[PDB]
Design a protein around this ligand. Structure first.
Ligand code: MOO
Ligand code: MOO
Ligand SMILES: [Cl-]
Ligand SMILES: [Cl-]
Ligand SMILES: [Mg+2]
Ligand SMILES: [Mg+2]
Ligand SMILES: [Mg+2]
Ligand SMILES: [Mg+2]
Ligand SMILES: [Mg+2]
Ligand code: NA
Lengths: 365, 365
């Protein structure tokens, strides 16, 4: 019974593809900042909260499915929705939260702190805090710059150390004080550039699918990762101006180690790829995707890798990740990108556990 | 009961935002081609079929809601899904159709002819047939070229007369013989360019929202339709190459009269616009959206136009329709675009009633 010996908190990541409940036990240091954070419960359900009908019956069944069987209920809960909910009209988001708030008003133990759609900049902050907590890089001032990417279904986040810059929007910068050190981060989220939303722009692009894959328009895949990559790069740069926004900042504030969470782990774990030590390079990702996936016959691939979820998109996703990281962020194709092993299902939720403590009894900072 | 006096057929348009059942009565001419087509039943339900959970309980409820109270059931039924279903994995589409097939197997009167996701090119053919049927332009050879656009949530279609060309893909050309005339059409659908999917790439663009509209990233709208239009044009052309594909063909094959169905009629019916005769020009649409919507204060607009669905997107949609029609298709900003009055809810379903008869007892043409 860990919550009889430690503080405990529930954090729900309500993302575009599903909601994942975490309960963490933790202790605190001399400034009442969480340490010894341990996950004691993890439950995920599908589909995304923004994808279910926003009526009482459906939302009530979904929250019961997510929460009722948790081992401890008398604890603070944060329900934070991300890019899936950001895509909806305000009226629709309000209907979801009104029904969710009603559901919690009928719960006598759960302590609902907040339920809301967070900005992609908050999500990026929590991404960086969660990964650095796990890497054990927060307790002391670092030799090296650690950058984090989160590759979601609807948005993608990038976040890295950068000194305050009064020429850049206040919304894209965060200063915090944690474990005795002052940290200044650049944060950005690109809504629409998550894998699900991006893919809906390229489904009839033959270069983005394995040979003979049946495209929606009745034509056939004819995969070519470099060509698909160039198409996705036009969405990255001509549309979203990722290069113009990110490249000059990384040039001035280089990152020594890149970590990624989200969907790269799922792709890179395919047996179609040869990666070791839970790390890849963009050049190897694009080359392997081109040679083993894009240029292979669809029917053969399909039968040969039967456990590979969204295998039909692996030519597209190899090309898209390279477009995003290389052509968008300007990362060198030969630079190592660490991905957190998929078994961990690491998300940003530990960031909430840490962040909520940093202002103590100041309520409006 | 019309169907005791006439042939009858049910056609379901299962689009990205909902499904609309029509039952038509009709007679036939001396080639057994439908004439005197009349709508005797129309029922719409939300949301889109591709948006409900694909299990027997939910699918069964949805088809029951859509079909059970129809006045006549012992007739052929076509269930044709469009771009909403095109966006999904093949496995997921198979789940939906396996459950739908099972549901129809428990029905003793409905005669399910086909239930499938049709290509955007098929949808574009039906778009042209349905509109030209309503305009009464099919029975005799036209001295005028009539073009049709269908502005959907996930795809948009364009279709216009074009003599058969050996240099253009067979998939984008259709020859038919109807009412004794031979008609040759160019058809194209752009998946990802329907309004819902398009909008997901611009939700954090301040130029695309009314002043002080709260964007997902925490920043404020600062509307400017020409600027928003140039952003949306980069998705049309740099990404989808609409201009390169369409403009040369319209240059060689001018359209004399443009008609649109789908979302234009919803937008243009707002009291923010001044249009007459159910027609607009792109020049006027972009100017009016810029000055009445983009440059206005969000809270004022929101309270002033309380019945306007998706009012918060009208600066974006004005800018996007211009980007698509002018910068994409190359239509002159001063060219009249007819929109079918919104009360009609005219879709492409009459196109199915006509097209199914054209090959008579030939089953593999
Ligand atoms: O809600 Mo997301 O899947 O992290 O873009
Ligand atoms: O399924 Mo659509 O809404 O006609 O693009
Ligand atoms: Cl298509
Ligand atoms: Cl955001
Ligand atoms: Mg996420
Ligand atoms: Mg292996
Ligand atoms: Mg439609
Ligand atoms: Mg969607
Ligand atoms: Mg009026
Ligand atoms: Na999308």
């Amino acid at each position: 019974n860990p919550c009889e010996k430690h503080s405990c908190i529930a954090v729900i990541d309500a993302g575009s593809t599903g909601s994942r409940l975490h309960i963490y036990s933790y202790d605190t240091d001399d400034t009442n900042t969480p340490i010894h954070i341990e996950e004691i419960w993890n439950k995920k359900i599908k589909p995304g909260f923004a994808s279910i009908q926003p009526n009482s019956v459906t939302i009530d069944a979904y929250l019961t499915m997510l929460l009722a069987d948790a081992p401890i209920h008398n604890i603070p809960v944060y329900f934070y929705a991300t890019a899936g909910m950001r895509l909806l009209p305000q009226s629709q988001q309000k209907k979801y939260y009104d029904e969710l708030d009603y559901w919690f008003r009928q719960q006598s133990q759960w302590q609902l702190v907040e339920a809301k759609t967070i900005t992609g900049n908050d999500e990026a902050l929590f991404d960086w805090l969660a990964v650095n907590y796990k890497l054990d890089t927060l307790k002391s001032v670092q030799n090296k710059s650690v950058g984090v990417m989160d590759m979601g279904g609807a948005s993608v986040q990038i976040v890295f150390p950068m000194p305050k810059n009064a020429e850049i929007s206040k919304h894209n910068q965060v200063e915090l004080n944690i474990y005795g050190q002052n940290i200044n981060l650049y944060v950005h989220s690109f809504l629409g550039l998550g894998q699900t939303e991006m893919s809906h722009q390229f489904l009839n692009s033959p270069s983005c699918f394995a040979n003979d894959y049946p495209l929606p328009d009745g034509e056939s895949g004819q995969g070519n990762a470099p060509s698909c990559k160039e198409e996705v790069t036009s969405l990255m740069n001509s549309v979203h101006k990722v290069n113009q926004q990110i490249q000059p900042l990384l040039a001035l504030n280089p990152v020594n180690e890149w970590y990624s969470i989200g969907g790269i782990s799922n792709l890179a774990s395919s047996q179609l790829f040869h990666f070791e030590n839970s790390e890849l390079t963009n050049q190897s990702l694009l080359q392997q995707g081109d040679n083993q996936i894009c240029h292979q016959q669809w029917d053969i691939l399909n039968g040969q890798y039967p456990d590979d979820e969204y295998l039909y998109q692996y030519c597209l996703l190899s090309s898209y990740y390279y477009a995003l990281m290389v052509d968008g962020y300007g990362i060198n194709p030969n630079q190592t990108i660490h991905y957190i092993p998929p078994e961990q299902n690491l998300d940003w939720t530990i960031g909430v556990v840490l962040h909520r403590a940093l202002e103590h009894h100041h309520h409006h900072h």
